[PDB]
Design an enzyme around this catalytic site. Sequence first.
Site, PDB file in Angstrom:
ATOM      1  N   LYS A  81       0.828  -1.201   0.000  1.00  0.00           N
ATOM      2  CA  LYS A  81       0.000   0.000   0.000  1.00  0.00           C
ATOM      3  C   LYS A  81       0.870   1.262   0.000  1.00  0.00           C
ATOM      4  CE  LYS A  81       0.589   1.806   3.339  1.00  0.00           C
ATOM      5  NZ  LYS A  81       1.838   2.519   3.840  1.00  0.00           N
TER       6      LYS A  81
ATOM      7  N   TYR B 292      -4.453   4.008   6.498  1.00  0.00           N
ATOM      8  CA  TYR B 292      -4.877   3.037   7.519  1.00  0.00           C
ATOM      9  C   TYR B 292      -6.204   3.447   8.185  1.00  0.00           C
ATOM     10  CZ  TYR B 292      -0.325   0.710   7.223  1.00  0.00           C
ATOM     11  OH  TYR B 292       0.787   0.029   6.786  1.00  0.00           O
TER      12      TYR B 292
HETATM   13  N1  LIG Z   1       2.450  -2.305   5.085  1.00  0.00           N
HETATM   14  C1  LIG Z   1       3.337  -1.593   5.878  1.00  0.00           C
HETATM   15  O1  LIG Z   1       3.220  -1.691   7.096  1.00  0.00           O
HETATM   16  C2  LIG Z   1       4.385  -0.784   5.254  1.00  0.00           C
HETATM   17  C3  LIG Z   1       4.339  -0.579   3.900  1.00  0.00           C
HETATM   18  N2  LIG Z   1       5.320   0.182   3.280  1.00  0.00           N
HETATM   19  C4  LIG Z   1       5.268   0.430   1.822  1.00  0.00           C
HETATM   20  O2  LIG Z   1       6.445  -0.166   1.284  1.00  0.00           O
HETATM   21  C5  LIG Z   1       6.965   0.641   0.210  1.00  0.00           C
HETATM   22  C6  LIG Z   1       8.414   1.033   0.526  1.00  0.00           C
HETATM   23  O3  LIG Z   1       8.417   1.636   1.762  1.00  0.00           O
HETATM   24  P1  LIG Z   1       9.978   1.596   2.504  1.00  0.00           P
HETATM   25  O4  LIG Z   1      10.380   0.183   2.358  1.00  0.00           O
HETATM   26  O5  LIG Z   1       9.624   2.188   3.849  1.00  0.00           O
HETATM   27  O6  LIG Z   1      10.791   2.638   1.575  1.00  0.00           O
HETATM   28  P2  LIG Z   1      12.447   2.515   1.563  1.00  0.00           P
HETATM   29  O7  LIG Z   1      12.782   3.850   1.003  1.00  0.00           O
HETATM   30  O8  LIG Z   1      12.996   2.132   2.911  1.00  0.00           O
HETATM   31  O9  LIG Z   1      12.858   1.315   0.501  1.00  0.00           O
HETATM   32  C7  LIG Z   1      12.493   1.744  -0.798  1.00  0.00           C
HETATM   33  C8  LIG Z   1      13.233   0.825  -1.798  1.00  0.00           C
HETATM   34  O10 LIG Z   1      12.612   0.840  -3.108  1.00  0.00           O
HETATM   35  C9  LIG Z   1      13.681   0.715  -4.071  1.00  0.00           C
HETATM   36  N3  LIG Z   1      13.596   1.821  -5.064  1.00  0.00           N
HETATM   37  C10 LIG Z   1      13.394   1.708  -6.457  1.00  0.00           C
HETATM   38  N4  LIG Z   1      13.377   2.894  -7.089  1.00  0.00           N
HETATM   39  C11 LIG Z   1      13.580   3.829  -6.062  1.00  0.00           C
HETATM   40  C12 LIG Z   1      13.663   5.228  -6.069  1.00  0.00           C
HETATM   41  N5  LIG Z   1      13.540   5.941  -7.246  1.00  0.00           N
HETATM   42  N6  LIG Z   1      13.869   5.938  -4.924  1.00  0.00           N
HETATM   43  C13 LIG Z   1      13.991   5.183  -3.777  1.00  0.00           C
HETATM   44  N7  LIG Z   1      13.934   3.861  -3.607  1.00  0.00           N
HETATM   45  C14 LIG Z   1      13.720   3.179  -4.793  1.00  0.00           C
HETATM   46  C15 LIG Z   1      15.063   0.656  -3.280  1.00  0.00           C
HETATM   47  O11 LIG Z   1      15.371  -0.619  -3.128  1.00  0.00           O
HETATM   48  P3  LIG Z   1      16.802  -1.217  -4.065  1.00  0.00           P
HETATM   49  O12 LIG Z   1      17.884  -0.464  -3.356  1.00  0.00           O
HETATM   50  O13 LIG Z   1      16.685  -2.720  -3.805  1.00  0.00           O
HETATM   51  O14 LIG Z   1      16.422  -0.739  -5.435  1.00  0.00           O
HETATM   52  C16 LIG Z   1      14.662   1.329  -1.944  1.00  0.00           C
HETATM   53  O15 LIG Z   1      15.456   0.793  -0.915  1.00  0.00           O
HETATM   54  C17 LIG Z   1       6.045   1.906   0.118  1.00  0.00           C
HETATM   55  O16 LIG Z   1       5.081   1.673  -0.869  1.00  0.00           O
HETATM   56  C18 LIG Z   1       5.389   1.947   1.527  1.00  0.00           C
HETATM   57  O17 LIG Z   1       4.107   2.515   1.526  1.00  0.00           O
HETATM   58  C19 LIG Z   1       6.407   0.699   4.022  1.00  0.00           C
HETATM   59  C20 LIG Z   1       6.506   0.523   5.349  1.00  0.00           C
HETATM   60  C21 LIG Z   1       5.475  -0.217   6.113  1.00  0.00           C
HETATM   61  O1  LIG Z   2       3.473   0.901   8.718  1.00  0.00           O
HETATM   62  C1  LIG Z   2       3.049   2.235   8.589  1.00  0.00           C
HETATM   63  C2  LIG Z   2       3.138   2.676   7.121  1.00  0.00           C
HETATM   64  O2  LIG Z   2       2.704   1.613   6.309  1.00  0.00           O
HETATM   65  C3  LIG Z   2       4.576   3.058   6.760  1.00  0.00           C
HETATM   66  O3  LIG Z   2       4.617   3.376   5.385  1.00  0.00           O
HETATM   67  C4  LIG Z   2       5.094   4.209   7.640  1.00  0.00           C
HETATM   68  O4  LIG Z   2       5.495   5.281   6.840  1.00  0.00           O
HETATM   69  C5  LIG Z   2       6.314   3.778   8.460  1.00  0.00           C
HETATM   70  O5  LIG Z   2       5.878   3.185   9.658  1.00  0.00           O
HETATM   71  C6  LIG Z   2       7.199   4.989   8.796  1.00  0.00           C
HETATM   72  O6  LIG Z   2       8.036   5.340   7.715  1.00  0.00           O
END
Ligand SMILES: NC(=O)C1=CN([C@@H]2O[C@H](COP(=O)(O)OP(=O)(O)OC[C@H]3O[C@@H](n4cnc5c(N)ncnc54)[C@H](OP(=O)(O)O)[C@@H]3O)[C@@H](O)[C@H]2O)C=CC1
Ligand SMILES: OC[C@@H](O)[C@@H](O)[C@H](O)[C@@H](O)CO
Lengths: 335, 336
Positions: free
Chosen positions: B101, B186
């Site tokens: 999401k 959420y």
């Molecule tokens: N359900 C939940 O509880 C959560 C859901 N999410 C969702 O997960 C997704 C990622 O969130 P998060 O993991 O926190 O984000 P991060 O920034 O920590 O990780 C993002 C990753 O996406 C890849 N990527 C590809 N293109 C780009 C770009 N142009 N700029 C930056 N990163 C890029 C990289 O991985 P690489 O280095 O391997 O290319 C980067 O590490 C979002 O959609 C967020 O909403 C996030 C946190 C909690």
């Molecule tokens: O899980 C919460 C949400 O899905 C996530 O995207 C938040 O941004 C994170 O907890 C803080 O970066």
Amino acid sequence: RKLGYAILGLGYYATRIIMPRFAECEHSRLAALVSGTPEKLKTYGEQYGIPETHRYSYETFDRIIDNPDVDIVYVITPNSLHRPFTERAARAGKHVMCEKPMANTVADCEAMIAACKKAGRKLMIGYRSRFQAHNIEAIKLVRDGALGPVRTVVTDHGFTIGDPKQWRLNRALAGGGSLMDIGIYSLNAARYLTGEEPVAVNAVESTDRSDPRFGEVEDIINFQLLFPSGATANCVSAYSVNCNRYRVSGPKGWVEIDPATSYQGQAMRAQLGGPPAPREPAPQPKNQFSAQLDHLSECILTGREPIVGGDDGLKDLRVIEAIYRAAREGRTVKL
Amino acid sequence: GRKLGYAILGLGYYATRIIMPRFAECEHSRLAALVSGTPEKLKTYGEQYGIPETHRYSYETFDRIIDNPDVDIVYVITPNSLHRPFTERAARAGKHVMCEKPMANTVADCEAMIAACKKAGRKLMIGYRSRFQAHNIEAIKLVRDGALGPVRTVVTDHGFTIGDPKQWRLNRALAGGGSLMDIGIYSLNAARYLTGEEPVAVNAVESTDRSDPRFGEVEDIINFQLLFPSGATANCVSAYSVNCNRYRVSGPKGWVEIDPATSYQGQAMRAQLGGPPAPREPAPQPKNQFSAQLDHLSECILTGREPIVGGDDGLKDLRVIEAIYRAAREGRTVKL
Ligand SMILES: NC(=O)C1=CN([C@@H]2O[C@H](COP(=O)(O)OP(=O)(O)OC[C@H]3O[C@@H](n4cnc5c(N)ncnc54)[C@H](OP(=O)(O)O)[C@@H]3O)[C@@H](O)[C@H]2O)C=CC1
Ligand SMILES: OC[C@@H](O)[C@@H](O)[C@H](O)[C@@H](O)CO
Ligand SMILES: NC(=O)C1=CN([C@@H]2O[C@H](COP(=O)(O)OP(=O)(O)OC[C@H]3O[C@@H](n4cnc5c(N)ncnc54)[C@H](OP(=O)(O)O)[C@@H]3O)[C@@H](O)[C@H]2O)C=CC1
Ligand SMILES: OC[C@@H](O)[C@@H](O)[C@H](O)[C@@H](O)CO
Ligand SMILES: OC[C@@H](O)[C@@H](O)[C@H](O)[C@@H](O)CO
Ligand SMILES: OC[C@@H](O)[C@@H](O)[C@H](O)[C@@H](O)CO
Ligand SMILES: OC[C@@H](O)[C@@H](O)[C@H](O)[C@@H](O)CO
Ligand SMILES: OC[C@@H](O)[C@@H](O)[C@H](O)[C@@H](O)CO
């Protein structure tokens, strides 16, 4: 030195909540009774030792002008009767305590304020929560900067109302539904927690008109407030669920009370630096009811203005009119 | 117990800290492949999780995954604007898709993703993990069993105090919007699964200081109101400048709340039903919400069923999100 109160409208709030609390007052005493039920004048007059010379009906009420033992009339009637009894009390040269909501409309509040001003008498609205320990503590935490700037106030007030025949469910006597009676606590708290007045209002109303309770007034009307500082409030007002709480939050943390504005039983929780934990308020010397009563007496005796005067009641009615309008027109109403 | 293979795509915080360690408790899912734009990550997590170099892909070689029968599902965990392109490519490579999401930046993007997976004949699921979390399942059950009576109000607040001004979440092009896209969703998603309804009217108010280094492009606070066909109402908070995570759902017979509601761990439920408000413990679940989410898609594929949180669920959130932004912008109630 104690000022004398006349209690007008001897219903649940007057007899079960307010009159017993003169016992803890330091500057207030019960001096007279005004009632439309002869039997109540006898019962409570005998119970509280009020002589027959100090018992009035609504027909003889205006004679109270000749009673120097009465300084203040406390109006505790259905909402639509607040204005005419307040005006009659002012014309009898008495100071006035009026229960919330102040009156049905902005224009009615303005008439009440003008009457008391003309008489050179003070006017106070019964917002007791402003004298309640946990509420005072929440206001203090905000003012002292413990939350940072207020960003959100989330507050819900409601109860599951019963008998369809009661005056609260009768538009002619109540002036409106849940917002007039219990939703006003959410609005009043949004205002005293931010310390601001709203500039924009959204609302949504939801009422089942097949319900025998809700032929005339509204059940649920929820509303959003925006304030000049950027602070926001999300508020619930309801006649079909039970709730009584608020949380105020800023970038540095938050504080909540649940129940928040009940007669007793307040419990505060805060997240300030560390994990959410209970928080005790600073102690107050008197319960919220006795404190409210003495506040008016002390203002009169010292020549000061009540912290919850007619203007506080009027400001709530201004927003209430905006809330009903926003729900009717389906748009953001500007103030 | 047959296990389907996951390719994890976009090795960022959620992927590596939260999701990948939870394959350990899965019963129908296994970590089979890695897809990353960072060679170092492919080496580190490849070695840590025992993923052969043949199963490590860059964004350059990702389309080759069509020839890898160990991969059944691609889990897209990138910034929001890239959900659609990687979902499209995964579908083209004959893989089922788990997508984080918010589903995508706009309704149009969501519809395209659904159409692409439909064309490929592969299943699509959105990572709404809360639907597999014990306390959330319990709140839904109480509502469905009539323990509250008809739902009258849902009051729900989600927010955190976001930090680094330069991160992708504060970039409009990559995130699609501010707090509503990331954490306010959420509140919206909960209002929908607690009522079991879709909104027909929306109000909203935005509050953002554009001079704040964080908020030049996206919103800080956007609060909204929902009205449902039954008469149920929701009051919702979405924020990037306060910490909150909670909901209470109320009816004439009582109420139940969870605080925190949708966190990774730590949920606590309180209810006012047969008596005064008291703690309530939910029915226990076999697996944690993460492992349960992973296994749900795999089981759906294995038994030929549809995910309870399919693409249509993500699309329904974006429809309301578009209406919320419009309501705040125009200062009016938006009808759906
Ligand atoms: N359900 C939940 O509880 C959560 C859901 N999410 C969702 O997960 C997704 C990622 O969130 P998060 O993991 O926190 O984000 P991060 O920034 O920590 O990780 C993002 C990753 O996406 C890849 N990527 C590809 N293109 C780009 C770009 N142009 N700029 C930056 N990163 C890029 C990289 O991985 P690489 O280095 O391997 O290319 C980067 O590490 C979002 O959609 C967020 O909403 C996030 C946190 C909690
Ligand atoms: O899980 C919460 C949400 O899905 C996530 O995207 C938040 O941004 C994170 O907890 C803080 O970066
Ligand atoms: N601040 C607070 O916490 C609370 C405030 N209130 C406020 O106090 C006021 C009274 O509420 P409550 O005391 O609960 O109401 P009740 O119905 O219990 O008492 C109302 C009284 O008003 C008098 N009255 C005069 N005309 C009428 C009429 N036409 N119909 C009915 N009663 C009439 C009667 O007293 P008599 O028989 O003596 O004429 C009646 O007993 C309201 O404005 C309410 O908002 C109420 C509860 C709590
Ligand atoms: O009956 C009202 C009278 O005028 C009295 O209340 C004065 O206000 C006096 O100042 C009391 O302090
Ligand atoms: O809380 C006092 C309120 O002013 C009163 O008018 C309500 O009707 C009462 O709370 C019913 O529960
Ligand atoms: O009289 C109780 C007191 O007013 C209240 O603050 C409690 O001590 C607190 O809620 C912890 O239970
Ligand atoms: O209504 C405003 C205020 O509450 C009231 O006390 C006036 O200041 C007073 O009537 C002036 O004489
Ligand atoms: O997007 C809808 C659903 O999530 C998806 O699984 C479809 O039903 C499938 O793509 C049809 O083949």
